[PDB]
RNA sequence: AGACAACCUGGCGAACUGAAACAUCUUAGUAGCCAGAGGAAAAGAAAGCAAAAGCGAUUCCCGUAGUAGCGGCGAGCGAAAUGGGAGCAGCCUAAACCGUGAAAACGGGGUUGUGGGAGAGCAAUACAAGCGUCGUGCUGCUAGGCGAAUCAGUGGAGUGCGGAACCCUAGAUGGUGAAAGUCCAGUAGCCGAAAGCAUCACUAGCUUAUGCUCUGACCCGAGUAGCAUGGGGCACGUGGAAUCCCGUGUGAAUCAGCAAGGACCACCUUGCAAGGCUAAAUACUCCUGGGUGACCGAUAGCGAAGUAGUACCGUGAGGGAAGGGUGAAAAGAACCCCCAUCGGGGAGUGAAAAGAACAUGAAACCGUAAGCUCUCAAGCAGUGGGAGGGGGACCAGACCCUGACCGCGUGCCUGUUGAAGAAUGAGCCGGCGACUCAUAGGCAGUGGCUUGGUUAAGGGAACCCACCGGAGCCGUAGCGA
RNA sequence: GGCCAGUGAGACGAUGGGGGAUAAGCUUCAUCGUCGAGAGGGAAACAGCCCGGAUCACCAGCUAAGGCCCCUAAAUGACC
RNA sequence: CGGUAGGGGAGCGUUCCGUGUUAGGGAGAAACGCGUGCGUGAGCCGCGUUGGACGAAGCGGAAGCGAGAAUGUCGGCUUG
């Protein structure tokens, strides 16, 4: 009984991984106030986007058991 | 495994102290001061090994100017040197200074060659 | 060229000597140690949380939770051990041989762990099998059993464990079958 | 095999020849594999017994300036600390375990490479076990000197059996190690000047570690 | 009855802290305090898990797993079943009924769950198994004993050195004027207990015991379960909130029952609450006996190698130091001289005076002697040039010490847009004094296998370690809530 | 792309401007240089101006910016 | 081939362990003091009209492993 790293749970309900090993997320803002957002915008906010390279650190740091390829 | 520092320090200190022998006052005594004083010494040394190369050319030139000025009324260092070059002689300033002191007659001759040829 | 305790030594590069910070400048990271000047990151003690940016609403908090997870809809889980035909080709199977589950542990092309142990087997078509094999599994993909019955292999489909049903629902589901049967006949 | 082995009877004449053929580490990494194996061995042997007291173990704190001077431990107005004499020890040793791991196959490889380096020394023997009945040290040493072992240089007897008479008869020489396969270490092989096997032993070793 | 280090059980039960504030949450049911018992305690013999296939009291380790989940869905918290091991053990009682009484009690009977027992009849009987005064037994512990093998030379001393020998079931260890298998005490090996203790066997004795058939009417742990409310605890924060345990109030059913299977109802499966008791595997060190130490060596190691919980300080709770190493042996210096003692100088002891404030004895700091040199001088004290003077040389043209006079030269650190700063810090010297360890994640470098790789706990001639131990784990399929 | 840092108080100078009084060694931006983190020379001394970017030795030589009465290196040079 | 924050490479030393009950050592070890010795440096190698019993090199391993700053800290000793 040592200590093993804990997965940061609030980060894992947000991000996940695709089979080839890139991280993805939802897009923000499709929840309420949709009437005044045009359909085109709503479609754009419906899809799954690969997380910006920049944040990869923070994310990766808080989800140590996520299997991830950064493509090396 | 506990390790006392032992002599590793005192040797270093001692080998510094050897350096600082014959410094007046507490520069030859206390370790902490001695350190600094070592560094400064080493530093001046380095500096003045460069100054040295400047200062002897200072000197040499001065002595040469003195040595020549005796002959002509109108003769200089500047004139001299310019004349040494347009006559194609290689002698540098150390040699002309040491020959100015230690073999004066020689310099008189040299001057007589430069004069004869500029004539 | 004989080994003794004294001629031994490591491989170049193997054990690289570690930075000891805080010793000397000329060495390495002396004084500050490579923490630069001051403020939080140079201070001793636990840092700030990994996912946290300055008090701006952190990235993970400003993004909405993933689809099913978000409410407590159970996560999707593998229910079979998928095998292609590739693997069964590469393996040493001579004709007539039974494949099943067990004989795939035998040759090792599947190493099951706990969750996987408790599972059944399913076959996925990929690659083109040349042999006649006797295959046993709880399930097949369409392309699978198509390619299999095309190559002349016998496909034994194993029964799954009966779902217990109370009698009333048997009466309903049977009443159905009686309807179909009286209608076609 | 690229080299024979002498098989000697109890009197020291050469009866026969054998071959001991094993998995060797490929010639470049040999040294390092053995090395590693060794390091591992010694390092697991170690018992970290070194213990200190941290700043919180040390007897007799109270949190205050000291009221009066304890000669050598403090002065009148000072704060309690690690920086006194008789203060806690910052980053001292605590009892450890030093135990590291290594692959089984790697281990075995070190063993083989060592024993296969030892083929420039080693003899074989005709299994003397019976000739000793009452434990006799003097006798064992006699036998050694007939085989050409100086009871100086540290030699290793690897055999299958411990026959009590043999075992006790060798118990008191500091340079001998009588090994069963039960106890066989990389350490002792590396250490030993002369290697000595029985026939049954060669049959064992050449099987366990045999190259295919 | 009191005492008792840690461990343990029960009762009360915080706060700083984390959440970059804080209030739910965290810290943590931790510390502390009270009470209690043991060498372990507690838990424990399914009103249990599970899922349509099965298990078979409790505890502990590995793993599942940082998975399912919980959460101002924030900080964080965090299971279980399957699977592998360690270790194994199951028993007493209430009620129906039959005896004795007016009772309340006592004696027999009776204890189980894919139901048992009471009731009513007919068969079997001898072995088996469990407990245990008394006692020579076995072993061990608490005193012990026997125990192999060497000499001379070498400058205080020989165990060292050179040179000869020998023992070894003994070459562990400590001592000895100096390092020893062979000098001493010992070690291997082998013998030994009147008395007490302990584990084991046996030990009269004490215990128990089967088998079938009929009978739903008799029993199967009541102010209980449940229900309504108020909480607590379960990984699970009231949530759809099961299971578990408590305040207030109501309040069942007996096997044709009752409970559990994560609201609830049906169906099936599993189990039998409201009475008890029980060994081992596990935790710990005020200690006892052995062992080892990439542990300390007098500022270290325990606070304590000497009066150490002392001196001293505090009304009191409490705080809490320092002082080790003459020599092998005191052989601790007779006698004379200075002489009131101390102290000294000879002599004598000693390998050495090492001379008692005595072993190596650095620096600061205090001096003494010899070489050069300063009293018209301005300077972070040096440095490049070197007048004059002095010293030990062998490459005598060199080295070393001094320093007439010229030039150059704004202490160190920290920290700053920037410092000689009149910015901080250091009296000086010597010691002590800081990126450490454990466990995981990622990356790199090296190896090992790639007939994919690897074992965890666990076992090991004590450790290490051969050889096991495939449970797990990583890689072989993705997409999708 | 990977691994893994500091930095996130700047100063003046040239130039374009705003605020201010076309005040400030003021303040705030824009395009540059030096200092920061740069020693050497010129500037009496003199972070930010000019020259130039210091691997090291030499009792060698040529120059830049700048200078040639004496302190103090070089012309008490020439001609208007 | 200037260099602060800072990153990377190559090394030296200290105590201990392996080799090792090692080589060497009352024909004087550690240490202490010295050098016209060798290193880019940390340092090494040599020497002792000190000292009185231990202990290298090589090839490896481990850390209570290098001090001038902490109004650090304990002793010693100054200044006034
Ligand atoms: Mg995948
Ligand atoms: Mg919606
Ligand atoms: Mg980063
Ligand atoms: Mg030590
Ligand atoms: Mg230290
Ligand atoms: Mg001088
Ligand atoms: Mg490290
Ligand atoms: Mg480095
Ligand atoms: Mg510093
Ligand atoms: Mg850093
Ligand atoms: Mg700082
Ligand atoms: Mg910073
Ligand atoms: Mg902090
Ligand atoms: Mg945290
Ligand atoms: Mg939502
Ligand atoms: Mg999925
Ligand atoms: Mg797998
Ligand atoms: Mg304390
Ligand atoms: Mg201490
Ligand atoms: Mg009591
Ligand atoms: Mg009491
Ligand atoms: Mg007790
Ligand atoms: Mg709070
Ligand atoms: Mg608070
Ligand atoms: Mg903390
Ligand atoms: Mg807080
Ligand atoms: Mg805070
Ligand atoms: Mg026990
Ligand atoms: Mg109990
Ligand atoms: Mg049972
Ligand atoms: Mg029961
Ligand atoms: Mg289990
Ligand atoms: Mg078992
Ligand atoms: Mg059982
Ligand atoms: Mg009974
Ligand atoms: Mg049933
Ligand atoms: Mg029934
Ligand atoms: Mg009956
Ligand atoms: Mg005896
Ligand atoms: Mg004897
Ligand atoms: Mg002798
Ligand atoms: Mg001898
Ligand atoms: Mg003696
Ligand atoms: Mg001895
Ligand atoms: Mg004995
Ligand atoms: Mg019944
Ligand atoms: Mg109730
Ligand atoms: Mg309700
Ligand atoms: Mg209720
Ligand atoms: Mg609750
Ligand atoms: Mg609840
Ligand atoms: Mg229950
Ligand atoms: Mg359950
Ligand atoms: Mg219930
Ligand atoms: Mg309760
Ligand atoms: Mg009832
Ligand atoms: Mg049940
Ligand atoms: Mg019951
Ligand atoms: Mg209950
Ligand atoms: Mg019960
Ligand atoms: Mg109990
Ligand atoms: Mg002392
Ligand atoms: Mg002490
Ligand atoms: Mg001492
Ligand atoms: Mg006297
Ligand atoms: Mg008197
Ligand atoms: Mg006297
Ligand atoms: Mg005398
Ligand atoms: Mg004498
Ligand atoms: Mg002394
Ligand atoms: Mg005057
Ligand atoms: Mg004068
Ligand atoms: Mg003066
Ligand atoms: Mg001067
Ligand atoms: Mg000046
Ligand atoms: Mg000046
Ligand atoms: Mg300021
Ligand atoms: Mg100052
Ligand atoms: Mg400042
Ligand atoms: Mg300031
Ligand atoms: Mg200080
Ligand atoms: Mg001050
Ligand atoms: Mg340190
Ligand atoms: Mg850190
Ligand atoms: Mg670590
Ligand atoms: Mg790691
Ligand atoms: Mg590899
Ligand atoms: Mg193991
Ligand atoms: Mg064990
Ligand atoms: Mg073990
Ligand atoms: Mg900002
Ligand atoms: Mg700012
Ligand atoms: Mg700052
Ligand atoms: Mg400006
Ligand atoms: Mg401007
Ligand atoms: Mg304009
Ligand atoms: Mg104007
Ligand atoms: Mg303006
Ligand atoms: Mg300004
Ligand atoms: Mg310009
Ligand atoms: Mg700066
Ligand atoms: Mg620059
Ligand atoms: Mg400049
Ligand atoms: Mg200047
Ligand atoms: Mg420039
Ligand atoms: Mg250049
Ligand atoms: Mg010129
Ligand atoms: Mg001039
Ligand atoms: Mg003029
Ligand atoms: Mg350059
Ligand atoms: Mg550089
Ligand atoms: Mg740097
Ligand atoms: Mg060394
Ligand atoms: Mg050493
Ligand atoms: Mg020796
Ligand atoms: Mg010596
Ligand atoms: Mg030593
Ligand atoms: Mg040396
Ligand atoms: Mg060396
Ligand atoms: Mg001695
Ligand atoms: Mg060595
Ligand atoms: Mg040394
Ligand atoms: Mg330390
Ligand atoms: Mg100091
Ligand atoms: Mg002060
Ligand atoms: Mg002091």
From Swiss-Prot, chain A:
It is found in: Plastid, Chloroplast. Component of the chloroplast large ribosomal subunit (LSU). Mature 70S chloroplast ribosomes of higher plants consist of a small (30S) and a large (50S) subunit. The 30S small subunit contains 1 molecule of ribosomal RNA (16S rRNA) and 24 different proteins. The 50S large subunit contains 3 rRNA molecules (23S, 5S and 4.5S rRNA) and 33 different proteins. The lineage of its organism: Eukaryota, Viridiplantae, Streptophyta, Embryophyta, Tracheophyta. It comes from Spinacia oleracea. Component of the chloroplast ribosome (chloro-ribosome), a dedicated translation machinery responsible for the synthesis of chloroplast genome-encoded proteins, including proteins of the transcription and translation machinery and components of the photosynthetic apparatus. The chain holds residues 88 to 159 of 159 of the full protein. Disulfide bonds: none annotated. Belongs to the bacterial ribosomal protein bL35 family. Signal peptide: none annotated. This is Large ribosomal subunit protein bL35c.
Swiss-Prot record, chain B:
GO terms for cellular component: chloroplast; ribonucleoprotein complex; ribosome. Keywords: Chloroplast, Plastid, Ribonucleoprotein, Ribosomal protein, RNA-binding, rRNA-binding. PROSITE patterns: RIBOSOMAL_L20. Signal peptide: none annotated. Its main location: plastid. The keyword Chloroplast applies. It is found in: Plastid, Chloroplast. InterPro entries: Ribosomal_bL20 (IPR005813), RIBOSOMAL_L20_CS (IPR049946), Ribosomal_protein_bL20_C (IPR035566). One of its GO terms (molecular function) is rRNA binding. It comes from the Eukaryota. One of its GO terms (biological process) is ribosomal large subunit assembly. SUPFAM superfamilies: Ribosomal protein L20 (SSF74731). Component of the chloroplast ribosome (chloro-ribosome), a dedicated translation machinery responsible for the synthesis of chloroplast genome-encoded proteins, including proteins of the transcription and translation machinery and components of the photosynthetic apparatus. Belongs to the bacterial ribosomal protein bL20 family. This is Large ribosomal subunit protein bL20c. It comes from Spinacia oleracea (Spinach). The lineage of its organism: Eukaryota, Viridiplantae, Streptophyta, Embryophyta, Tracheophyta.
UniProtKB/Swiss-Prot annotation, chain C:
It comes from the Eukaryota. Transmembrane segments: none annotated. GO terms for molecular function: mRNA binding; structural constituent of ribosome. One of its GO terms (cellular component) is chloroplast. Residues 25-37 have a biased composition (Gly residues). The keyword Chloroplast applies. GO terms for biological process: translation. Residues 1-43 are annotated as: Disordered. Its main location: plastid. It is found in: Plastid, Chloroplast. Residues 14-24 have a biased composition (Basic residues). Keywords: Chloroplast, Plastid, Ribonucleoprotein, Ribosomal protein, Transit peptide. Component of the chloroplast large ribosomal subunit (LSU). Mature 70S chloroplast ribosomes of higher plants consist of a small (30S) and a large (50S) subunit. The 30S small subunit contains 1 molecule of ribosomal RNA (16S rRNA) and 24 different proteins. The 50S large subunit contains 3 rRNA molecules (23S, 5S and 4.5S rRNA) and 33 different proteins. Component of the chloroplast ribosome (chloro-ribosome), a dedicated translation machinery responsible for the synthesis of chloroplast genome-encoded proteins, including proteins of the transcription and translation machinery and components of the photosynthetic apparatus. Belongs to the universal ribosomal protein uL15 family. This is Large ribosomal subunit protein uL15c. It comes from Spinacia oleracea. The gene is RPL15. The chain holds residues 78 to 262 of 271 of the full protein.
UniProtKB/Swiss-Prot annotation, chain D:
The keyword rRNA processing does not apply. Disulfide bonds: none annotated. One of its GO terms (biological process) is DNA-templated transcription termination. Its main location: plastid. Residues 66-76 have a biased composition (Basic residues). Keywords: Chloroplast, Plastid, Ribonucleoprotein, Ribosomal protein, RNA-binding, rRNA-binding, Transcription, Transcription regulation, Transcription termination, Transit peptide. Residues 57-88 are annotated as: Disordered. It is found in: Plastid, Chloroplast. The keyword Plastid applies. Highly expressed in cotyledon and weakly in roots. This protein (expressed without the transit peptide) is able to provoke transcription termination from the spinach chloroplast rDNA operon and the E.coli S10 operon in vitro. Component of the chloroplast ribosome (chloro-ribosome), a dedicated translation machinery responsible for the synthesis of chloroplast genome-encoded proteins, including proteins of the transcription and translation machinery and components of the photosynthetic apparatus. Belongs to the universal ribosomal protein uL4 family. This is Large ribosomal subunit protein uL4c. It comes from Spinacia oleracea (Spinach).
